[PDB]
Structure formats: C-alpha cells, structure tokens
Specification:
Chains A, B: Belongs to the bacterial flagellin family. This is part of a larger assembly, with 2 copies of chain A (55 residues). Chain A has 55 residues and is mainly alpha-helical. The first copy, chain A, is built from 2 helices and no strands. At the A-B interface, helix 2 of A face loops of B.
C-alpha cells in the first residue's frame, strides 16, 4: 500500500500539478506582449491627428 | 554453510548496495548544476525587457 500510494500520487501529480518554471516564462512573455500592445494602441489613438493640419 | 553464507552475502552486497560517498559526490554535483540552471533561467527570463524601450 505504501508503494502503490507513492506511485499513485506521483502519477496524479504528473497530470494535475503545474510546473512553475515551465510557464512563468510564458507569464513574462505575455506581460511583455501586453505592454507592447498597450504602447502600440496608445500610438494608434494619436494616428488621425495629422488630418487637423489640413483644417 | 556459515562461510558460504558470508561470502555470498558479500557478493550480493557488491551489486545491490550503493556506495555512499561516490553517490553523494554525484548528488552534490547535480545540486550545484540544478541551482546554476535555475539561476540562469531566471536571469534569461528578462531578455525581452530590452525591447520595450524602443516603444
């Protein structure tokens, strides 16, 4: 029962538990992506401002 | 039978039993390797931060 329990727990952890190092890189990647997206959006708001030079 | 038992026990121990020192050296080598690797991964996780300054 000890042997089966430890192997069973290992098998369960291999499926449900998350590997923090595996996707903390993904988290940082997504943070960089969202920052770049916010910057590009804010750049996009001021894009039509050049029209006013013709009025 | 006594002599045969002691000889056979020694022969079996030559195979199944582990060497404590020659295992601890590898264990500590693996330890320094893994901590170096996790430090290197942690420092490599911040590479994209050099890009957002261009935004």
């Amino acid at each position: 029962l000890m042997n089966a329990y430890e192997n069973t727990q290992a098998s369960e952890s291999r499926i449900r538990d998350a590997d923090m190092a595996e996707e903390t890189v993904a988290f940082t990647k997504n943070q960089i992506l969202v920052q770049s997206g916010t910057a590009m959006l804010a750049q996009a708001n001021v894009r039509p401002q050049g029209v006013l030079s013709l009025l």
